[PDB]
């Protein structure tokens, strides 16, 4: 057997609530699973991707473990989608759970190779502190102006910083352009 | 706008979990919400809860035709927006037009329940629900038999599996209940409706 | 193993397409499939035909279990995984014990139908199908009248609303059916089962 | 409003079906659609010209929604792209193979899997157990294809099979974890 479950989607979206819910499902048939968090819900706290391997090598290890939950992916480096495909080839169910976007509204961390990894996705959804549609992105603000593009990606807290908004509703002052003919289209439109 | 979600499936599915989260969501926004359940025992249950920790207040309601009496009543908060209905299977078929009709004037409607009863069988009023809720999701519970997803209620009495004949409506827990898979789901005394359903079951022992 | 999916919604969703398409996956890995069909819907005459990509062979039937002699006959290939059901509304009640029983004996059972008639209630047997599926796949067309999701089939003779007590039967495409949202599908003369419903619509039109 | 949609899988999963399906559901409501594909529909050299593509008087003003077929042969620009078309109040479906044959993802879609408001993942029967499938596999006189091959091969049946994860064996595949093979070897032992 073997596969990887991914939940996903920004804050305020309930993604720790779903893993729970779904880690709860197997303590009433009895099947044992394990969860890693990178350094509330009951975890192994671990500092890099391969420490998790190791754990499962180390005498801590229930051998009676068929699932694995991974907490807070985005916090870990590349190393986690390795580590995931290998646990899912050698007989485990992986559970992951993590941000997708950064507060720039881009892949934040690792976790864009892990929606290719993962053989399910669950993309959850949030409200939009705005104007109450499907929420898709985390905002962050600062006394209350739009955090500039090129502050630190990590940054912890909770509402004091953070709200969930839809792609409409959120705004990076200053963010750039890849493509040269961008900024000329946006013009092009903002024309009707 | 408006429209209905339903949460299903079996027990220990973690349905009324899905239902909670869905509405903890709306409290970030400031979005308001009212939640109402049947009145099963002598119990005065004011609370529906999720074993991931949150509890969010619940109105009982003996009837479905209350739910919009309370909405018409000086209890209702006029921002409400969403509409939790936790177990609708113990309501009775009036449940759709309720929901319908909240829906038709801009309530979210987020509808949780059982789709089966011991039997294995559609439980109550829910399978009209299914055609009126504008989106479905149907959880799975791990089957306490094999690990497979289990999609089935089973209940046991002293051990030995529930009769067909058995009363629908029993309160419970795992004294009672597991959750099991198709193939792991047995009713012993189970009509067939068909003319040829047995024959069929024979010709394909036969191999 | 066994396990039925349903796949489901109003009009001009591309249930038939969707059919197709599972279908079609099942060829490239040399899987074989069986499809069957009711005889009243006369718009495709043993085949199963989407408006688009191809079309491919059903047998047709009356009644639900003549697919299960179908099955026993020697008609059958014995390689047959996977058998499919399109246009499900058309049967009775017989389909869910055929379905059941196909799923219990290894066959993966693939369904495609819509969950409501004209008058935007459970067509035929569709109900209970939703039950028992272990996979429901609710998808949705465009609302003729907004652009919106569209969830319902509204029947018009003449450009005039169908009204509720018109026979639900009634073959034929966009000379009388299109697809709409719920806030623009309207049944002239749609009863109240809840005596206190019309009171309730009377009481949330005053704002 | 404005939004992504994203369907994927690998080959033989009926993609391209499921994408002209949504693309039929337009026409019954009279919407219109137009849809590009990569020059390996209008055919297109790389994901900028989509949007001179709109900006010029070959675009239809009506146009709602923008398909774009097979988008694992365009580069990371695609998403740049798909992200401002959605910004300005396009509907943007998406289709492509999310892996190329090392299982990989594959070319600029794993990127497109974050900025998609809807993601459907299909799969397709996989040719050795019938299972579901997730990945595309390659075969040459009936050997896999090595790591170490070129990424972009067109061709169908003739090299490519659809496989679930066990099925799915790329020789000389590496591991960039120091304790991968370690861990493998570890199990095994039973
Ligand atoms: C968007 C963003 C969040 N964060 C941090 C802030 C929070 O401490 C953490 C988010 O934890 P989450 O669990 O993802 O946030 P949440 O609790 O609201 O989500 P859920 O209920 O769905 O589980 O990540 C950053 O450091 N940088 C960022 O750019
Ligand atoms: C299957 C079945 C259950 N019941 C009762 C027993 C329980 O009191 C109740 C089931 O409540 P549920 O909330 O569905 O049980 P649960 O808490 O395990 O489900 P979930 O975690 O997914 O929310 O219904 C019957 O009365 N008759 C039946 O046939
Ligand atoms: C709504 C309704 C339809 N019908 C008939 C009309 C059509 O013959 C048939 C609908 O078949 P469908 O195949 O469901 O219509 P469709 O071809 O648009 O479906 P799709 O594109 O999603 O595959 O049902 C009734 O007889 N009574 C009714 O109340
Ligand atoms: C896996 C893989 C495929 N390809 C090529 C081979 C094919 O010509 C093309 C994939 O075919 P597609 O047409 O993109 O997908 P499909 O038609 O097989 O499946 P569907 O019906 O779902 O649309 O891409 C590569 O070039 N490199 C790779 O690594
Ligand atoms: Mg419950
Ligand atoms: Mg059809
Ligand atoms: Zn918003
Ligand atoms: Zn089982
Ligand atoms: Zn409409
Ligand atoms: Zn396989």
């Not at 057997?1 to 819910?21: D, H, Q, S, Y």
């Not at 991707?49 to 916090?75: C, H, R, W």
């Not at 559970?95 to 720039?104: A, Q």
Request: hydrophobic share 40%; charged share 25%.
């Amino acid at each position: 057997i073997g596969w990887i479950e991914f939940i996903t989607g920004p804050m305020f979206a309930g993604k720790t609530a779903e893993l729970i819910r779904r880690l709860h499902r197997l303590e009433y048939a009895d099947v044992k699973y394990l969860v890693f968090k990178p350094k509330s819900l009951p975890s192994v706290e671990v500092e890099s991707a391969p420490e998790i391997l190791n754990y499962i090598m180390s005498n801590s290890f229930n051998d009676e473990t068929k699932v694995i939950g991974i907490d807070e992916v985005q916090f870990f480096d590349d190393r986690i989608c390795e580590v995931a495909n290998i646990l899912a080839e050698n007989g485990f169910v992986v559970i992951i759970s993590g941000l997708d976007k950064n507060f720039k509204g881009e892949p934040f961390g690792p976790i864009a190779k892990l929606f290719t990894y993962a053989d399910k996705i669950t993309k959850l959804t949030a409200i939009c502190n705005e104007c109450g549609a499907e929420a898709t992105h985390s905002l962050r603000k600062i006394d209350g102006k739009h955090a500039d593009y090129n502050d630190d990606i990590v940054k912890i807290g909770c509402q004091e910083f953070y709200s969930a908004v839809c792609r409409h509703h959120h705004k990076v002052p200053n963010r750039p352009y890849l493509n040269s003919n961008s900024e000329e289209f946006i013009k092009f439109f903002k024309n009707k």
